[PDB]
Amino acid sequence: QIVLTQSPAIMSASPGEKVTMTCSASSTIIYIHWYQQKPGTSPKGWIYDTSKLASGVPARFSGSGSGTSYSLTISSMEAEDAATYYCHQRTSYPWTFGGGTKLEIKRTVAAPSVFIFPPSDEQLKSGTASVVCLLNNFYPREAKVQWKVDNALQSGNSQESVTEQDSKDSTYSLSSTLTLSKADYEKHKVYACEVTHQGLSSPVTKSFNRGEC
């Protein structure tokens, strides 16, 4: 089975820039093909016969190579090109795909809008208390959320999730849930979510006193 080592694993580039993207097969193949997958979607054909462009694919795109080393290139990056790109060999069995190169849009640092949601009336009836802190529309993806309850750092009782790069503004969002028994939740007053991020010169803290609508 021919491997297809892709590189870089991940890279960023802003509109207008030229990007190049590598695929190395471990044994000579005839043509390397390329597929594009954006988050949520299935792969789409992009380049076949190590050069030809699929239907609907802009001419910024080109691929070259021979033997065991192939490239893909966008002449000038556009917003819609941010995706993960897989190379593919149909020349010996079993057919195989590369590991992929994730291409993200590069933009200016942007600070998160930080929001905090207490647990609902509904959920507290069920004997659990989920507190949600939301970091909306920031850049870059690196961020740090620390939970403090009466100024006691929390560990082990929170979980995080990060959206992929927004199509309109090229930012990320993040939601974090600190989950607690209602017995524990009712023991304390200040619930704070402290955010550290490059768009902030010092950490933003967003909080609420237990019971303040």
Binding site: Q1, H33, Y35, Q37, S42, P43, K44, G45, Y48, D49, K52, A54, Y86, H88, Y93, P94, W95, T96, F97, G99, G100, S113, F115, I116, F117, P118, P119, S120, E122, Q123, S126, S130, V132, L134, N136, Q159, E160, S161, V162, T163, D166, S173, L174, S175, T177, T179, K206, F208, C213
Partner: protein
């Protein structure tokens, strides 16, 4: 029109076996060989079945479990994986073979391998308050807690609201159940006037839920 339509999310006990469908609609089904692909969580070719002849070729590693049928009279391709393990938990794509490349793909089918019983979410509101407003726009959302398996789908106002919506990837909790968040940013002036539903569908548990997110002073 042209469209590969796969079976819904499946949850199957270890050991036993599962079959998934892929119906080619909008075009002559026999004219195109049909493949399958396993996105482990990165693509991995499984094999081929000619809608026309019925013969197949496989990735070695999948011989033993993976097996492919076609029923020409329903225009449906079938894949069956057997001796199911955790390794088989993944999304499985069917991709019609085009003249020059894989040109139509199904939306994929999610296969979670586990002996556990299905579990439909609880939906809790994330009401908009001053703690969630900035620049005369307020954030609101729904908390879709403690379901199994993946996936759930969330929409707002049966699809009429789509700008400003962020639906976050599910997080696996310590309990072994999933939980995710969907938020939307709207103008502060809309609250009180323009109500907001979140519509949650969990096909493995046959759960539909609408939840109205009302503000607070």
């Amino acid at each position: 029109q042209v469209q590969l339509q796969q079976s819904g999310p499946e949850l199957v006990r270890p050991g036993v076996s599962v079959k998934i469908s892929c119906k080619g609609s909008g075009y002559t089904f026999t004219d195109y060989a049909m493949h399958w692909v396993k996105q482990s969580h990165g693509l991995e070719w499984i094999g081929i079945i000619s809608t026309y002849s019925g013969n197949t070729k496989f990735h070695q590693k999948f011989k033993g479990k993976a097996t492919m049928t076609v029923d020409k009279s329903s225009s449906t391709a079938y894949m069956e994986l057997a001796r199911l393990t955790s390794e088989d938990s993944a999304i499985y794509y069917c991709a019609r073979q085009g003249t020059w490349y894989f040109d139509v793909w199904g939306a994929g089918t999610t296969v979670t391998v586990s002996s556990a019983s299905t579990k439909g979410p609880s939906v809790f509101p994330l009401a908009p308050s001053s703690k969630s407003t900035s620049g005369g726009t307020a954030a609101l959302g729904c908390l879709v807690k403690d379901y199994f398996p993946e996936p759930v789908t969330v929409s707002w106002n049966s699809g009429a609201l789509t700008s400003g919506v962020h639906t976050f990837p599910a997080v696996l909790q310590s309990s072994g159940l999933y939980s995710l968040s969907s938020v939307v940013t709207v103008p502060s002036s809309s609250l009180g006037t323009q109500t907001y539903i979140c519509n949650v569908n969990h096909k493995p548990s046959n759960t539909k839920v609408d939840k109205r997110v009302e503000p607070k002073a």
